């Protein structure tokens, strides 16, 4: 209804860059009169549907007092195209009759969509009649546009040219701190006891978009009410699912480096690689190329491989591409070796961001002039290997990790230092290792002191930690049915 | 190990747009369309 | 209308030179011949119209060779009687097949230079562009035109990407590009030897056609161009060389001694390195 | 507030070519009186957009003061009964009425394109109803249309002809200090200090079509205020034009790199022979091409790479695009192989027509064992099969003129996967295996990379290259890698 500018927070940061963006030009509209150029018309944002986009543009329209013109997408765009384009030209005329005017669209995608080789749709007579209305309109009148969408690369490319949509700005989800400062918000009226925590309770979602928390409140609050005929937060996490249900970034294990224990010469000489250019860039501008992207990690089967995987990928909080081994899914000749494209420009978009792959080394078996082959894949997808992996930029430093149980077939044009060059064997936990991995997987477990892990460490000489791993699940599983013949008598 | 590729085509309309029957319209024409306030309409006699 | 942009283009060069503070406009020769350089043909990538042939000894040799192919474009065209008096079909068709380097053009195009009628030809760009209709369609006003438009000579290349798969003992499942090996055999019969058609099959591989191609009726006659031997590899680089001012004091028959492996695309290799360090001598 | 013929500099040449052409039929029509010729009416204007096409426009309408009419191309194309074939006759009557007059349609491919994708819809019978609009043109020296696009190969053959549009112009990009003259008219107005030069703008902003600039000095004048944390005296300074070089893209967001990647001749280890034989290439026959027609032979056309990977195939690969600036293009190997089996051939062709058309221009291949596959596709069976790439390019690359700055160049890692003819002479010439750096080139190698980083001097340069017996230039790299991630240690 009425919100305001204390409502939202995590885009502070972009926050306050569209204040001096939409009430600057507004308030002081004479500003660019002394500097001389047009203040500027079009700003949009994207990023996840659902961290309050169309929020936002109503929180900073009552916070300044101006009209507020709204279109929506997929309501005017469904017409017969015929009053798309009066809509369009109404909408311009009343916004300049009642100045200072503000005109939020959302949907723009479904608007203004891209071409492509599936043609058939209208796909024109209304974008082209936004360009000759937006290209004019400049002389000192108090009029914005703000454009919200989904996909920011599903838009037609004539818009963000100049002049139009010049300005961008990328909400997407908020970090440890922003999650906690709308689980403050969202908790403003519901009396809760001082049983409930906010830093671990935030800490411990790590993946939600600002949608959620609406409902996960609402949620933990209607199982209170259903007792009377207040630690219910965390039975609504077991039966709420989150947003961003079954795509790449997934979160759900909240393993960090305190609950994976040894492999002192792996931790180290990750943090030499993945985390110094994405936190201090001032040196590796001036020693050499900056981003160490390629890592390679082979051993025995069950020896921690990607146990390490969702472990740094959660100490910074960046996104984890989790891409299993047989994804190139080959469905005919030409897409195999462009669906490995789109996750690469997906990876640079959401910079930094760890990839994972699976044993896509296939050049060596690609030999020339032999008959027994196949029908395009597994011999020029390692082509496409050779010519998007060393795609990097400066302002991305994207890494890409990599983990395999098979050493010897590694192709003779992968181990370069322009592909994955820095290869670590992973061995197996010793004495010492063995005590750190399997004390800190009992943790969870309310488990007596009186039995030390030395004994087990003195019982298991060649086993591998996720042997290991068994003797904990079955100290565990035997737990249980101790706990199981303890309340029926 | 391989693959079935094939496009499509369309065909989008035609319009003419022929509408307004002649008995509609003859029907359209003998009706009221309301009068203001005060416009009153009228009657008159003669011719005893 | 090609004929119309040649003279009006030069009046119009004419007047951009005659401009200052309407005397004397004739259209000079030279207006004409930069009407000629900066403007084109109608052959925008369309059906080619042009009749590019080259004259005898040209290809190194072939003293042993001008005599077979002396009787499959001139006496169908010289002599129309001998065919209408026995009751012969003339064979419209040689496919040509030989070594690298020559072979596809200059093999074929010495052939016919005393017809010198317009060639249309399919080529690589000329396939299947579009999905539907449009893969023997563009073909079709080829083959029903060369009656029609006698005398045209229909030049066939690349056989390899049009009939390789579809033709086998495997072939096309599913219906979804099988139409290109029908009407390359249906219009082979229909067509009869009434006006001057002419076609001239040349590949590199001839056993990756389809054998019905090599049907008896219509590739009765079969050529071969061979490799040019020691004797008409030293006219092979005096054929090359033609524009170039090569002083005569040389010897290159002991270039060519040294070829005996080596095409006339090697030959042309040894020739192109001559040449580089030729123009660095004057730089 | 209307635009004229000051309002837009960096495209002189063309500006005064496309006067003549609506002056001369409209001022003094005269000079087509006894001389025979009827005066044109299509000017084709075409290029990149962000160039000024539609600003070549107003500025040629308000400077005359003709009967302007703007005619657009999502705008008229209808679907109800074939309006848009009645509104492009309603048009040309309304401009037939008033004298002098002149029409304008962009975007001409949007309206009726070539038909080798849709073929049967109503634009085949909307281009035919231009063919003869334009060619029923017989008022002399009234009407004068110009158009404006952004390909020229999109479209029909059929309007490139005598009657409706010859005089094609081509918009090209301000490279010959024409950006200082599109900085001379948006700097103009704003207040400027005493450190800011022109000059010294247009030698760093490669590209940069126009629209860009301007783009570039509202976001320096954004950086202005940005300090003011709120009588005003603000100004511009240099480093508003360098911070707005790094925190703003050019021209890059449809591919990310076609201009180059900031290397120079210097940048590849050791290779100086390769250095002498790469001055041989196109850096070679354009500034004199008439020395091959006076010795009456065609240049060489391809050079061919293969060997150990990583050993300069992407360095000297790029390094042609900075040692002549040419129009480069940047193309991956299985980038080119597309999922339809129609487009199996016609994705070359556009490729090689760029090439034609951005001359001169230089273009590369990656990863050619994708592309040749010499046994010719493997079992067949299927509706496409992978036989029509190969034998499209070595075709193509020979219906091609000598004079028009065509070639290419190699950099594959298997001999054996490519074909015999794809290395045959005339196509691929010199077969030049690139060799592995002995001891003596191995010490520039490391050199490459210690030209930008401030080595310390007491270090030995040649006592960490003698530990090579027979590495490769990039296992160079990987030490330099290595001590990138070693040199710090202690700054945290
Ligand atoms: N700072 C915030 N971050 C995330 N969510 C918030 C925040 N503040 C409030 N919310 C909640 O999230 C919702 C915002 O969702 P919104 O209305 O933007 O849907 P949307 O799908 O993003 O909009 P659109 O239909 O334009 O995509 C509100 O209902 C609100 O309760
Ligand atoms: N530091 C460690 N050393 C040994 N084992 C570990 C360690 N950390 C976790 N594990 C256990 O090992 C398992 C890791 O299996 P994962 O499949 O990730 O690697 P893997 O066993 O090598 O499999 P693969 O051989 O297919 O790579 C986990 O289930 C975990 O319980
Ligand atoms: N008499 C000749 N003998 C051999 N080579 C010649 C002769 N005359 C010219 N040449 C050179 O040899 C080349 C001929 O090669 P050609 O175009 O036939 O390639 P090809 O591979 O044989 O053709 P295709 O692709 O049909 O197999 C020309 O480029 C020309 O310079
Ligand atoms: N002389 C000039 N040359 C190039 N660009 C200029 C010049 N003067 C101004 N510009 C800038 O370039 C832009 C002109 O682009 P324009 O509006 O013509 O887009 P366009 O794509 O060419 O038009 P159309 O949509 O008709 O193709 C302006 O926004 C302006 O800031
Ligand atoms: N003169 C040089 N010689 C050898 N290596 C060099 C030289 N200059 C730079 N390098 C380093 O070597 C690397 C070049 O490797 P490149 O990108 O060519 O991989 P490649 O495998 O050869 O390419 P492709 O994938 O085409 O085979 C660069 O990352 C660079 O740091």
Same mark, same amino acid.
């Given at each position: 209804n009425?919100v305001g500018?204390?409502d939202?927070?995590?885009c502070?940061?972009?926050?306050a860059?569209?204040?001096?963006?939409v009430?600057?030009?507004?308030?002081?509209?004479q500003?660019?009169?002394?500097?001389?150029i047009?203040?500027?018309?079009?700003?949009?944002?994207?990023?996840?549907?659902?961290t309050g986009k169309?929020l936002?543009?109503?929180?900073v329209?009552?916070?300044?007092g101006a009209?507020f013109?709204?279109i929506?997408?997929?309501?005017v765009?469904?017409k017969?195209?015929?009053?798309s384009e009066?809509?369009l030209?109404?909408?311009?005329?009343?916004?300049?009759?009642?100045?200072?005017?503000?005109?939020?669209?959302d949907?723009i995608?479904?608007?203004?969509?891209?071409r492509d080789?599936?043609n058939?749709?209208?796909?024109?007579?209304v974008?082209?009649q936004?360009l000759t209305?937006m %290209?004019?309109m400049?002389?000192?009148s108090?009029?914005?546009?703000?454009?919200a969408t989904?996909r920011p690369?599903?838009?037609?490319?004539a818009?963000?040219?100049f002049?139009?949509?010049d300005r961008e700005?990328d909400?997407?989800?908020?970090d440890?701190?922003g999650?906690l400062e709308?689980?403050?918000?969202?908790?403003?009226?519901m009396?809760?006891? %001082?049983?409930v925590?906010?830093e671990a309770?935030?800490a411990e979602?790590?993946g939600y978009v600002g949608a959620?928390?609406?409902?996960?409140?609402?949620?933990?609050?209607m199982?209170?009410?259903?007792?009377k005929?207040?630690?219910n937060?965390?039975?609504?996490?077991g039966?709420?699912?989150?947003?961003?249900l079954?795509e790449?970034?997934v979160?759900?294990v909240?393993?960090?480096?305190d %609950?994976?224990?040894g492999?002192?010469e792996i931790?180290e000489?990750?943090?030499?690689?993945?985390?110094?250019?994405?936190?201090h860039?001032?040196?590796?501008?001036?020693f050499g190329?900056?981003?160490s992207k390629?890592?390679?990690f082979?051993?025995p089967?069950?020896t921690?491989?990607t146990?390490?995987?969702?472990?740094?990928?959660?100490?910074?909080?960046?996104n984890?591409?989790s891409?299993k081994?047989?994804?190139?899914?080959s469905?005919?000749?030409?897409?195999?070796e462009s669906?490995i494209r789109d996750?690469?420009?997906?990876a640079?978009?959401?910079a930094?961001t760890?990839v994972?792959?699976?044993?896509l080394?296939?050049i060596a078996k690609?030999?020339?002039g032999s008959?027994?082959?196949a029908?395009g894949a597994?011999?020029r997808?390692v082509?496409?290997?050779?010519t998007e992996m060393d795609?990097?930029?400066?302002?991305?430093?994207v890494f890409?990790i990599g983990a395999?149980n098979?050493?010897?077939?590694?192709d003779?044009?992968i181990?370069?230092?322009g592909?994955?060059d820095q290869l670590?064997?992973?061995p197996?936990?010793?004495?010492?290792?063995?005590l750190?991995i399997?004390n800190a997987?009992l943790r969870?477990?309310?488990?007596?002191?009186?039995l030390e892990?030395?004994?087990?460490?003195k019982?298991?000489?060649?086993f591998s930690?996720a042997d290991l791993?068994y003797?904990?699940?079955?100290?565990a599983?035997?737990?249980?049915?101790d706990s199981?013949?303890?309340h029926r008598? | 190990?391989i693959?079935?590729?094939?496009?499509?085509?369309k065909?989008?309309?035609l319009?003419?747009?022929?509408?307004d029957?002649?008995?509609?319209?003859?029907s359209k024409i003998?009706?009221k369309?309301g009068?203001p306030?005060?416009?009153?309409?009228?009657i008159?006699?003669?011719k005893? | 209308?090609?004929?119309?942009?040649?003279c009006?283009?030069?009046?119009?060069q004419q007047?951009r030179?005659?401009?200052?503070?309407?005397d004397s406009?004739?259209?000079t020769?030279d207006?004409?011949?930069?009407?000629?350089?900066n403007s084109?043909?109608?052959?925008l990538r369309?059906?080619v119209?042009?009749?590019?042939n080259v004259?005898?000894?040209?290809?190194?040799?072939?003293?042993?060779?001008?005599?077979?192919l002396?009787e499959?474009?001139?006496?169908p065209?010289?002599?129309?009687?001998?065919?209408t008096?026995?009751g012969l079909?003339?064979?419209?068709?040689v496919?040509f097949?030989?070594?690298?380097?020559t072979?596809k053009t200059?093999?074929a195009?010495?052939v016919?230079?005393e017809?010198?009628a317009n060639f249309?030809?399919?080529?690589?760009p000329?396939?299947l562009?579009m999905?539907?209709?449009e893969?023997e369609?563009?073909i079709?006003?080829?083959?029903?035109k060369a009656?029609?438009?006698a005398?045209?000579?229909?030049?066939?290349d690349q056989?390899?990407?049009?009939?390789?798969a579809r033709?086998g003992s495997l072939g096309?499942?599913?219906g979804?590009?099988?139409?290109?090996?029908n009407?390359?055999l249906t219009?082979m019969?229909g067509?009869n030897?009434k006006?001057n058609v002419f076609?001239?099959?040349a590949?590199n591989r001839?056993?990756?056609?389809?054998?019905?191609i090599?049907?008896?009726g219509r590739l009765?006659?079969?050529?071969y161009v061979p490799?040019?031997?020691?004797?008409?590899?030293?006219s092979?680089?005096?054929?090359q060389?033609?524009?170039?001012?090569l002083?005569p004091?040389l010897?290159?028959?002991?270039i060519?001694?040294?070829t005996?492996g080596?095409?006339?695309?090697d030959?042309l290799?040894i020739?192109?390195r001559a040449?580089?360090?030729?123009?660095?001598d004057?730089?």
């Open positions: 009425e500018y204390d939202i927070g995590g502070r940061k972009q926050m860059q569209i204040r001096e963006m009430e600057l030009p507004l308030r002081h509209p500003l660019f009169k002394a500097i001389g047009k203040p500027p018309r079009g700003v949009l944002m994207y990023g996840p549907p659902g169309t936002m543009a109503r929180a329209a009552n916070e300044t009209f013109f709204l929506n997408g997929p309501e765009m469904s017969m195209a015929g009053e009066s809509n030209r109404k909408a311009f005329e009343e916004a300049e009759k009642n100045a200072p005017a503000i005109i939020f669209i949907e995608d479904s608007i203004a969509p891209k080789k599936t058939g749709e209208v796909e024109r007579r974008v082209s936004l209305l %290209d004019g400049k002389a000192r108090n009029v914005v546009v703000i454009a989904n690369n599903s838009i037609d490319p818009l963000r040219r002049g139009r949509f700005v909400i997407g989800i908020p440890a701190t999650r709308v689980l403050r918000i969202h908790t403003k009226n009396k809760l006891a %001082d049983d925590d906010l309770l935030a979602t790590h959620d928390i609406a409902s996960l409140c609402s949620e933990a609050a199982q209170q009410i259903r007792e005929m207040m630690d937060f965390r039975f609504a996490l039966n709420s699912n989150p947003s961003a079954r790449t970034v979160e759900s909240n393993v960090t480096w %609950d994976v224990g492999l002192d931790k000489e990750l943090k030499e690689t993945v985390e110094y250019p994405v936190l860039p001032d040196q590796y501008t001036k190329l900056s981003p390629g890592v390679l082979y051993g089967p069950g921690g491989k146990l390490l995987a969702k472990a740094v990928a959660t100490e910074v909080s960046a984890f591409i891409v081994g047989p994804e190139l899914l469905m005919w000749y030409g897409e195999s669906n996750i690469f420009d997906k640079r978009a959401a930094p760890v994972f792959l699976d044993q080394d296939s690609a030999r020339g008959l027994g082959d029908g597994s011999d997808v082509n496409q290997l050779l795609g990097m930029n400066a302002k991305k430093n890409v395999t098979r050493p010897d077939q590694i003779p044009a181990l370069r230092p592909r994955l670590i064997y992973v197996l936990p010793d004495e010492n290792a063995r750190s399997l997987q969870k477990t309310p488990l007596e002191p009186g892990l030395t004994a087990i460490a019982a298991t000489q060649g930690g791993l003797i904990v699940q079955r100290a599983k035997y737990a249980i049915k199981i013949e303890a008598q | 190990q693959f079935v590729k094939t496009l499509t085509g065909t989008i309309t319009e003419v747009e022929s509408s029957t002649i008995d509609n319209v003859k003998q009706d369309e009068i306030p005060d416009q009153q309409r009228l008159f006699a003669g005893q | 209308a090609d004929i119309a942009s040649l009006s283009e030069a009046a119009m007047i030179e005659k401009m200052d503070l309407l406009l004739g259209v020769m207006n004409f011949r930069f009407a000629l350089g084109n043909p109608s052959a369309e059906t119209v042009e009749s590019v004259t005898w000894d040209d290809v190194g040799g072939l003293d042993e060779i001008k005599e077979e002396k499959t474009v001139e006496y065209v010289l002599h129309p009687d001998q065919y008096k026995f079909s003339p064979s419209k068709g496919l097949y030989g070594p690298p380097g072979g200059l093999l195009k010495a016919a230079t017809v010198s249309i030809s399919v080529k690589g000329e396939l562009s999905w539907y209709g893969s369609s563009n079709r006003d080829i083959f029903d009656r029609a438009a005398p045209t000579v229909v030049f066939l056989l390899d990407s049009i009939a390789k033709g096309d499942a599913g979804a590009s099988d139409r290109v090996v009407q390359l219009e019969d067509m030897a006006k076609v001239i099959g590949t001839p056993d990756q056609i389809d054998p019905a090599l049907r008896p009765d006659q079969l050529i490799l040019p031997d020691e004797n008409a590899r030293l092979i680089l005096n054929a060389l033609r524009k170039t001012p002083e004091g010897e290159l028959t002991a060519a001694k040294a005996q080596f095409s006339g695309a030959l290799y020739v192109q040449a580089k360090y030729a123009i660095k004057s730089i």
